Curated annotation (Swiss-Prot), chains A, B:
GO terms for MF: carbohydrate binding
Keywords: Glycoprotein, Lectin
Pfam family membership, one: Lectin_legB
InterPro entries: ConA-like_dom_sf, L-lectin, Lectin_legB_Mn/Ca_BS, Legume_lectin_dom, Leguminous_Lectin
Organism annotation: Psophocarpus tetragonolobus (Winged bean)
Protein name listed in UniProt: Basic agglutinin
Classification via PANTHER family: CONCANAVALIN A-LIKE LECTIN FAMILY PROTEIN, LECTIN
Annotated glycosylation sites: 44, 219
Family: Belongs to the leguminous lectin family.
Organismal lineage: Eukaryota, Viridiplantae, Streptophyta, Embryophyta, Tracheophyta
Free-text function comment from the UniProt entry: Lectin.
Amino acid sequence: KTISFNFNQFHQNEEQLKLQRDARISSNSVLELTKVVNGVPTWNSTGRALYAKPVQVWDSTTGNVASFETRFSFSIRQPFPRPHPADGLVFFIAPPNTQTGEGGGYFGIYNPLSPYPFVAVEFDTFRNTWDPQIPHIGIDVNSVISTKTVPFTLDNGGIANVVIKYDASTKILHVVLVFPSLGTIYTIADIVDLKQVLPESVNVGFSAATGDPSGKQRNATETHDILSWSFSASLPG
Amino acid sequence: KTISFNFNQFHQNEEQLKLQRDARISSNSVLELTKVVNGVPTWNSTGRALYAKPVQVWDSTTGNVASFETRFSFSIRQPFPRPHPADGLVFFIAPPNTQTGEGGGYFGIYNPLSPYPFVAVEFDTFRNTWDPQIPHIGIDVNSVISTKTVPFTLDNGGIANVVIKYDASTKILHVVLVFPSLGTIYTIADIVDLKQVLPESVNVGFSAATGDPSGKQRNATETHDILSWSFSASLPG
Ligand SMILES: *[C@@H]1O[C@H](CO)[C@@H](O[C@@H]2O[C@H](CO)[C@@H](O)[C@H](O)[C@H]2NC(C)=O)[C@H](O[C@@H]2O[C@@H](C)[C@@H](O)[C@@H](O)[C@@H]2O)[C@H]1NC(C)=O
Ligand SMILES: *[C@@H]1O[C@H](CO)[C@@H](O[C@@H]2O[C@H](CO)[C@@H](O)[C@H](O)[C@H]2NC(C)=O)[C@H](O[C@@H]2O[C@@H](C)[C@@H](O)[C@@H](O)[C@@H]2O)[C@H]1NC(C)=O
Ligand SMILES: *[C@@H]1O[C@H](CO)[C@@H](O)[C@H](O[C@@H]2O[C@@H](C)[C@@H](O)[C@@H](O)[C@@H]2O)[C@H]1NC(C)=O
Ligand SMILES: *[C@@H]1O[C@H](CO)[C@@H](O)[C@H](O[C@@H]2O[C@@H](C)[C@@H](O)[C@@H](O)[C@@H]2O)[C@H]1NC(C)=O
Ligand SMILES: OC[C@H]1O[C@H](OC[C@H]2O[C@@H](O)[C@H](O)[C@@H](O)[C@@H]2O)[C@H](O)[C@@H](O)[C@H]1O
Ligand SMILES: OC[C@H]1O[C@H](OC[C@H]2O[C@@H](O)[C@H](O)[C@@H](O)[C@@H]2O)[C@H](O)[C@@H](O)[C@H]1O
Ligand SMILES: [Ca+2]
Ligand SMILES: [Ca+2]
Ligand SMILES: [Mn+2]
Ligand SMILES: [Mn+2]
C-alpha cells in the first residue's frame, strides 16, 4: 500500500499542504517555516507545514508497520552571529490534526499543557539546558530531549541535503545530512518502534522556531527554509 | 581508550600499512588495490591493504564492545563497459594476520579452505549467482552473501565519499555513499553484533579483486583505488 509524493518547489498556496502559524510560501517558491521580513529573519516566530493527507504507518489488523524514505533540502541563514541564533527546525511525524506547540527550544512540536506523541529528527541550533553542544542532529521520541545526538557544522545560508530512512524490519531510523558546498557528511541512526509510539495514521511535516521573547534577545533568530521535499512509504498490509 | 589514524594521501613505502598481493601505492599517492599496468586495469588481480597495528573492538573483561567511525574516498574506473566489469572492493574487519583469500566474487576476503570470521561493507560491481542487481552496497558477516543490500549507480572514474559508522549501544552499522560530482546519496544500515562474530583484537583494511580467469574475459576488470582513509575507535573498557 505504497503512498508517495514529491515537491520540487512549492507553488503559491499549495493545495497539498497545511501551513500553520508563521509558515508561508515565498514568491520565488521556497517554503519559509519561520517569519522573515524584508530579507531579515525575525525572533518570536513559529511555523509548521504538514502534508494535507494523512499517511498510514502501521495497520492494527495485520500488525505490519511501514517502511519509508524521505528526502529534503533546507537552508538556514544566520545573519547575526552574536549572541546566538535559534532555534532550529525538525522533520516530524505526529497524530493527524494537531496544533502548533510551544516555540523556542520546543520547535513548535511539543506542547506541555496537552502533549501528543511524536517522532522527529531535529536540526538544533540553540543550546537549551537539556542540549549537548550545537548545532546538532538529534532523534526525538515524544520529547525534545534527543535519544541520540550528533554534532555538525552548519553552512550558513548554504544548502543542505537530508535523507531520512526507516526500515520496519530492523526498526532502524537512519538520517544523513550533507552540505554539498562543503562536501561534509554527517550520519546518525537509532532504533525506534513507530508501532509503539504513534497511532496507525499520522501527519508528516516540518516545524521550526526562532528565539523566544523571554530570552530578551532579538538577534536570537535565523531562517528556516525548505527547498524541496519527497516522501515515500510502503505498508505491506 | 582511543585509537585513530588519518591518511590524506598514501606514501610510497608507508610504514603503517600492510600491503598484500597486487596491492601497491602509486607515485602520485593513490592506493591501488588491484593491478593496473600502463594506465590499464588487469584481470586476475587481487590486493588488500591492512592497518599495521591491530585494533581492539571489544574487551572480554568488561564485556564492552567499541564504537567506531571510518571515512574514505575511492575511485572505480571501468574502461571496458562490455561484457562486464568485476569485481569490486570492500572495507573489512577480520582477525589479525590473515592471508588473502579467494579472488573474484570473493574480493580476497573469503577463503573456502580456511574460513575466518569477518565483517565487511562491500561495493559490488559484478553479479554472481548470489547477488542482487549491481552495482550495490552490501553488508557482509562471515559470508559474501550480504545480509542487507542497496543498489547504487557508479560514477565511472569519479570520486566517492564513504562514511561507515558503528554504535556499540544500538549495534547499528550504518554506511553512507556519496558521489559529490553527481550529488547522489546512498544509505544502508543493519544490526551487527561484533562481540558475537569477531575476536577482541582485529585488523581493519580494504580488499579488492578483478575478473577471475575462469570467466575467460579479460575485459572483466576495473580499478580499485583508495584516495584517503581515516579510522577512529573508542573502547570504554
Ligand atoms: C545584533 O546583531 C547586530 C549585527 O550582527 C550587532 O551589531 C553589530 O555589532 C558589531 C560588533 O558587535 C558592530 O561592529 C557592527 O557595526 C554592528 N552592526 C549593526 C547592524 O548594528 C549587534 O551587536 C551589539 O549591539 C549593537 C546594537 C551594537 O551596540 C554592537 O556594538 C553590539 O556588540 C547584535 N546585538 C547583540 C544582541 O549582541
Ligand atoms: C573488450 O574491450 C574492448 C575495448 O572496449 C572492445 O573493443 C571495442 O569493442 C567495440 C564494440 O564492443 C568496438 O566498437 C571498438 O572498436 C573496439 N575497440 C577496440 C579497437 O578495441 C572489445 O570488443 C570486442 O572486439 C571488437 C573488435 C568487436 O568484435 C566486439 O564485438 C568484441 O566484443 C571487448 N571484448 C569483449 C570480450 O567484449
Ligand atoms: C510574539 O508574537 C506574538 C504573536 O504574534 C505577539 O502577540 C507578541 O507581542 C507581545 O505580546 C502581545 C500580547 C502584545 O502585548 C504586544 O504588544 C507585545 O509586544 C510577540 N512578542 C514580542 C515581545 O514581540
Ligand atoms: C593469475 O595470477 C596468478 C598470480 O598473480 C598467477 O599465478 C596465475 O597463473 C599464472 O599464469 C597462468 C597464465 C599460467 O602461466 C600459470 O602457470 C601461472 O601460475 C594467473 N592466471 C592467469 C590466467 O593469468
Ligand atoms: O534567547 C533565545 C532562547 O530563549 C529561550 O531561553 C533563554 C535561555 O537563555 C539562556 O541564556 C539560559 O541559560 C536559559 O536558561 C534560558 O532559557 C528559549 O528557551 C530558547 O529556545 C531560545 O529561544
Ligand atoms: O567473468 C568474471 C567472473 O568470473 C567468475 O564468474 C564467472 C561466471 O560466469 C557466468 O556466466 C556464470 O553464470 C557463473 O556461474 C560464473 O560464476 C567469478 O566467480 C566472478 O566473480 C567474476 O570474476
Ligand atoms: Ca535547542
Ligand atoms: Ca559479486
Ligand atoms: Mn536538541
Ligand atoms: Mn554482492
